[PDB]
Each structure stands twice: as structure tokens, then as C-alpha cells.
Amino acid sequence: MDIHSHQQALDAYENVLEHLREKHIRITETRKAIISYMIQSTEHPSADKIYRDLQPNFPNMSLATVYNNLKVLVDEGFVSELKISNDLTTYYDFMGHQHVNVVCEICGKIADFMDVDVMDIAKEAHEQTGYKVTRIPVIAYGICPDCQAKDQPDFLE
Amino acid sequence: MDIHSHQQALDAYENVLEHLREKHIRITETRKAIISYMIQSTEHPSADKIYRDLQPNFPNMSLATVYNNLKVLVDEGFVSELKISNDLTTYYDFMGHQHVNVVCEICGKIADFMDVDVMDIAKEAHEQTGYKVTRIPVIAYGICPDCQA
Ligand SMILES: [Zn+2]
Ligand SMILES: [Zn+2]
Ligand SMILES: [Zn+2]
Ligand SMILES: [Zn+2]
């Protein structure tokens, strides 16, 4: 979506929850499960696939529940509906962003930026290693604009 | 460049370093300086711009040296050349990759994969904050094939 900040670092999962809280959308345990499922998914599952995979942990989950949750995620801009030719089945893919800190090596001042790239790292990590990716903590380092304008320091951090 | 592994984590800089070593290409101080510059650049500079930017902190840098080292990087597939006219101005695009570790949460066994994305993070980090990005250490975590189900 549009470039913005929540004034703190948030991974993909925590970002979704923050956005949903901002909109006063209730965060059920089922909703958390579906978000995490979609984030971890290394394919583009149908509604039925999501339903079948989460069914054991959630006996009270129905296909309607999955549709309801996907509707929220698609509208709030964290999941896209994809199509394959000749197939009428809708497939879903998580592409939601995250927010990453950049820390000044000299003064320690922190800024944050919106990232959509680490999820692509997660996909490549899975494909090339076979690992089911759990987390990719990322922190950037650099020189803040104010420190760029000053002379070279005698010490860092 | 095809997917491959060096059996160790390597950032963009160290990766370029490992690649030329593998092919017995000499590593000089000028070569290092130009590789580092190209990796950290957020634009596509001309040879003259590379020269002018590097000279104050590398006084022995010359335009000829810039062309020489760029040719090595272009031939080795790390830099692509862009032309938009017929004068002697060419622009240079660093197309690197790096290798990132994935660590198993359960057993701790490490694998690595080829990444072309963290350099794009660095670009976005600069554009959104104004910081001159110096480094972005990255390690992935997951469950290795053996520890799964
Ligand atoms: Zn956000
Ligand atoms: Zn600073
Ligand atoms: Zn390599
Ligand atoms: Zn393991």
C-alpha cells in the first residue's frame, strides 16, 4: 500500500494486526491462525486448502469462516486473489508489507521504513533450502542525515 | 547468474570477492574500492562520476582505473552497462547477489541461499529515511527438512 509508519518495527504478522487494530477489527484466534498460515504459505492456497489445513486445530472452523477472513485480508490489502487460466478456482497469496528499523551507526538514532522485500527473501530461502521459514529478523544500519553533515567521529555507537 | 552456493554466508561485497577469487582474478585495492562504491550506490553513475566521488578518499584513483575495474565487473556479470547516447558517457548498474544463512530453530543446522533482494531493501531504506545505508546483516530462521513433521 501507500508509504506510512507505525513509529516502530513490525514484521509481516505484527503489521497486519496493527493495521487491523487501527480499523477496530476484532482479532480472533482463528483470524491470527489464518494470517500466520498465509504468511508461512509457500504456495497460493485455495479457500478449501486453507480450510482443510487448519481444520484439525480448529474443529469449529467452516469454509464460511475462511471466506470471511480472506475477505478482510483482501480488502485491507494484505492478500491478493490470483487466477490461473482455464481454472475458476481463486487462489490466495499473502504479500503484506512490514516495517524495518534503520539505526545510525554514529548516534544511534532510529528511523523506520516500509518493506515488501523480506517476504521475497522468505520465498527464496524456502525454495533453495527446503526449510519452512519461521522468521527473518532484519535491521538496517547507516548514517542519519544529521550525522552526514558533521565531521567524522572518534568513536561509534 | 544461476543459483549456486559457496557453502558460507557472504554479503554482496564478500560475494564479489569470492567470485573473482574462484576464477583467479586479482584483488587490488582499487578493485575493492570500486566494488564497494558500486554496491552502496543508489543511482546508476557514469565512469566520471565514480572517479570524482572516489578520488578525495582514494587520491590515486584515475578514470582509466575506473574503466579497468568496471570492465572486470561487467565481464564477470556483476555490472551492466547502460547507454542513452553516442558520446563517451556510459552508466553502470550493479547487479549483484549475496548468500544468506538459514538456521534451523530446532537442531541449529545451517543452510544458505542466494539472495538478490537485500540490496533492494538497502535502496528502499535510503529513499525512505535519507540514511546513507552501510550494512544490513540478515539471517533467516526456519525448520530444516529433517526436523519437519
Ligand atoms: Zn504498516
Ligand atoms: Zn546519526
Ligand atoms: Zn555467489
Ligand atoms: Zn533441523
Author numbering:
A (entry chain B): 1 to 157
B (entry chain A): 1 to 149
Reproduce the article's own wording on this structure:
PerR is the peroxide response transcriptional regulator that controls genes expression under oxidative stress and it is required for full virulence. PerR belongs to the Fur (ferric uptake regulator) super family known to be dimeric, metal-binding regulators. PerR has been identified as a repressor that blocks transcription initiation by binding to a specific site (the per box) in the promoter region of target genes. Similar to Fur and Fur-like proteins, the GAS PerR monomer can be divided into an N-terminal DNA-binding domain (residues 1–94) and a C-terminal dimerization domain (residues 98–149 in chain A and residues 98–157 in chain B).
We solved the crystal structure of PerR to 1.6 Å resolution by three-wavelength MAD phasing, using zinc as the anomalous scatter. The structure represents the assembly of a homodimer in the asymmetric unit. Each subunit consists of six α-helices (α1 to α6) and six β-strands (β1 to β6). No exogenous zinc was added during the process of protein purification or crystallization, suggesting that an endogenous zinc is normally bound at the regulatory site, coordinated with residues His4, His6, Asn15, His19, His97, His99 in a pseudo octahedral geometry. The results showed that mutations in the residues of the zinc-finger motif or of the regulatory site, abolished the DNA binding ability of PerR, but not the control residues H44A and N101A. The overall conformation of our GAS PerR-Zn-Zn structure is substantially different from that of the B. subtilis PerR-Zn-Mn structure, which displays a DNA-binding-competent conformation. Our recombinant GAS PerR protein with a DNA-binding activity, however, exhibits a DNA-binding-incompetent conformation similar to the B. subtilis apo-PerR-Zn structure. SAXS studies show that the crystallographic structure of GAS PerR is indeed consistent with its solution formation. Alanine substitution of any of Y67A, N69A and K83A also reduced but did not completely eliminate DNA binding. This study strongly suggests that residues Arg21, Arg26, Arg31, Asn69, Tyr67, Asn68, Lys71 and Lys83, located on the positively charged patch, are involved in PerR interaction with DNA. In the model, the DNA-binding interface is contributed from two adjacent PerR homodimers in tetrameric assembly. This distinct DNA-binding feature explains that PerR dimer alone is in the DNA-binding-incompetent conformation.
